[PDB]
Structure 1
Amino acid sequence: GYGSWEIDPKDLTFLKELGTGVVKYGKWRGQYDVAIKMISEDEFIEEAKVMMNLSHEKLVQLYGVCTKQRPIFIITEYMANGCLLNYLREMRHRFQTQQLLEMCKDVCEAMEYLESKQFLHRDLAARNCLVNDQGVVKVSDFGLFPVRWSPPEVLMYSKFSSKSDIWAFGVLMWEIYSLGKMPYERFTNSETAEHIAQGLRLYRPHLASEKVYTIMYSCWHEKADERPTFKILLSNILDVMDEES
């Protein structure tokens, strides 16, 4: 069994549908808001297995699993403000410019945890983060081609490492400060690939100060070994936060 992670499906009260495996909102024992993912069977449950070993306040938290019933459920904490990408596009009336860097910090704390566990995300993007009722950003979908979030060594030789997560984080910062624009907005993936290899980088978004841009820019160093760690980036972000607020 999955031990204490096994949830009784009869403690769930399904309330609203959120998308379509199948994602719904509900309550667990009339008390806690949850998101519920419905469903191959063996590879679906892998997401949950990864999530049983990773726990952080900026990482979407597994609550449990229902595996003794078809279909199988995955249950997690509920993120009321949904996807970070849509939030950045549709919910600007709800956050200040200073808060953009706080969103960055939330993601950076999650990524520093993952990095310390020697665990790669491989798909870090605004689309793969979620936002709770307080505007706290959390990394999601880490239990499960993104050309626009990839460094050249990934594009050219499928060289995945901590430094490929670092590159994508920089692109995520760019997404945040550009209020959810698609990176390389006038290029196809193929053109993006070509231009990246030639050393073209994303421009400084208007809302980003020079200090902030330096932080995202450092994530895009051509040499993977020259890119910082999440530990370094977290310290860079706190520093700028102290200065710019």
Structure 2
Amino acid sequence: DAWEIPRESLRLEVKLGQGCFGEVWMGTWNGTTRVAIKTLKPGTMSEAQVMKKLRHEKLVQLYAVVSEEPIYIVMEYMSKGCLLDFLKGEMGKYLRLPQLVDMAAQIASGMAYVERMNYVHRDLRAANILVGENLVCKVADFGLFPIKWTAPEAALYGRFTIKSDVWSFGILLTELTTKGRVPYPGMVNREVLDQVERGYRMPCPPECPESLHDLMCQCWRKDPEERPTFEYLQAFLEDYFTSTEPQYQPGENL
């Protein structure tokens, strides 16, 4: 493969995190290109062909690999990290509804491409979205309980579809509109399981327009196939402030 690279071409400069499966680093590639490098611990496992052939402006791009152990994965670099941390921290404070809805439109657009390609994400949530400069957001972490973000069919009967991802997108919309709070505040996993089965849904977060909550509630319909597509979600969010909320005026937090 042309994607396979020499081990000397990667400088691992800054350790970013460490999870169960390995590490993540900001680095350089061929001395010129900024990159993110994920490291698989040897023993953990032994798909990037898929990821080579998943190209979209709003999906973190695979750039290069090292396929014999120890494995290194080279990727597009998203400077600001986690969408969840970005929402909670010093940048949360200034984001208003137009920035957040535009962000949601990006992630919709990445998820619309995943939809066209007949793939399933399975863990769509603010923790698995990466942010770059100028509030660019991209879907990441396709190849790996978050029951609060997981549709009932999926959590209960392992029925994971693009429509279970739509459900998670409604949940993500609440994360954006609350600056990253955990959904169902004060509820534990079983409390949530039990309540959403009985018809309970998160209410309109403070300052969030009702037209948006409405969209969230379409995403949380009992029947997977009654939920909208990502092509619909994207288009609605893109056109939001002309077609749906033309009289939006700034508030204290949204």
TM-score class normalised by the smaller sequence: over 0.9
Structure 2 matches for 1:207-218, cutoff 5 A? 207-218=207-218
1:36 aligned to 2:37? Answer: yes
RMSD: 1.7
Aligned counterpart, 1:200: 200
Aligned counterpart, 2:83: 84
Please say if residues 41 and 70 of structure 2, whose CA atoms lie closer than 8 Å, have aligned partners that are also in contact: no
Aligned counterpart, 1:234: 234
C-alpha displacement of 1:41: 5.6
Please say if residues 215 and 237 of structure 1, whose CA atoms lie closer than 8 Å, have aligned partners that are also in contact: no
Work out the number of aligned pairs and report it. Answer: 241
Q: Distance in 2 between matches of 1:228 and 1:45?
A: 37
**Structure 1 residue runs of 4+, over 6 Å off?**
none
C-alpha displacement of 1:149: 0.9
- Read off the aligned partner of 2:77 and give its amino acid letter: Y
Q: Distance in 2 between matches of 1:111 and 1:37?
A: 23
Task: Report the CA distance shift for 1:44/1:216 in structure 2 as closer, same or farther (over 3 A).
Answer: farther
Task: Report the CA distance shift for 1:18/1:40 in structure 2 as closer, same or farther (over 3 A).
Answer: closer
C-alpha displacement of 1:30: 2.2
Q: Distance in 1 between matches of 2:2 and 2:134?
A: 28
Q: Distance in 1 between matches of 2:228 and 2:157?
A: 21
Aligned counterpart, 1:4: 2
Structure 2 matches for 1:91-102, cutoff 5 A? 91-93=91-93, 95-102=95-102
C-alpha displacement of 1:144: 2.5
Q: Distance in 2 between matches of 1:95 and 1:183?
A: 19
Please say if residues 97 and 207 of structure 1, whose CA atoms lie closer than 8 Å, have aligned partners that are also in contact: no
Q: Distance in 2 between matches of 1:98 and 1:106?
A: 13
SS of the residue corresponding to residue 4 of structure 1 reads coil
Q: Distance in 2 between matches of 1:28 and 1:235?
A: 37
Q: Distance in 1 between matches of 2:157 and 2:67?
A: 38
SS of the residue corresponding to residue 225 of structure 1 reads helix
Aligned counterpart, 2:251: none
SS of the residue corresponding to residue 145 of structure 1 reads coil
1:193-219 superposed Cα distances (whole Å, 9 cap, x missing partner): 101101100121224211111111110
Please say if residues 51 and 143 of structure 1, whose CA atoms lie closer than 8 Å, have aligned partners that are also in contact: no
Q: Distance in 2 between matches of 1:178 and 1:109?
A: 22
- Read off the aligned partner of 1:101 and give its amino acid letter: V
Please say if residues 121 and 165 of structure 1, whose CA atoms lie closer than 8 Å, have aligned partners that are also in contact: yes
Match among 15, 38, 42 for residue 17 of structure 1: 15
C-alpha displacement of 1:43: 7.2
- Read off the aligned partner of 1:17 and give its amino acid letter: K
Task: Report the CA distance shift for 1:44/1:80 in structure 2 as closer, same or farther (over 3 A).
Answer: farther
Task: Tell me the TM-score normalised to structure 1 length.
Answer: 0.92
Aligned counterpart, 1:60: 60
C-alpha displacement of 1:183: 0.5
Q: Distance in 1 between matches of 2:42 and 2:53?
A: 20
Please say if residues 215 and 236 of structure 1, whose CA atoms lie closer than 8 Å, have aligned partners that are also in contact: no
Please say if residues 106 and 234 of structure 2, whose CA atoms lie closer than 8 Å, have aligned partners that are also in contact: no
- Read off the aligned partner of 2:199 and give its amino acid letter: G
SS of the residue corresponding to residue 191 of structure 2 reads helix
Task: Tell me the TM-score normalised to structure 2 length.
Answer: 0.89
Q: Distance in 1 between matches of 2:153 and 2:13?
A: 45
Percent identical among aligned pairs is: 40
Aligned counterpart, 1:171: 171
C-alpha displacement of 1:157: 1.4
C-alpha displacement of 1:155: 2.6
Please say if residues 66 and 73 of structure 1, whose CA atoms lie closer than 8 Å, have aligned partners that are also in contact: yes
Aligned counterpart, 2:154: 154
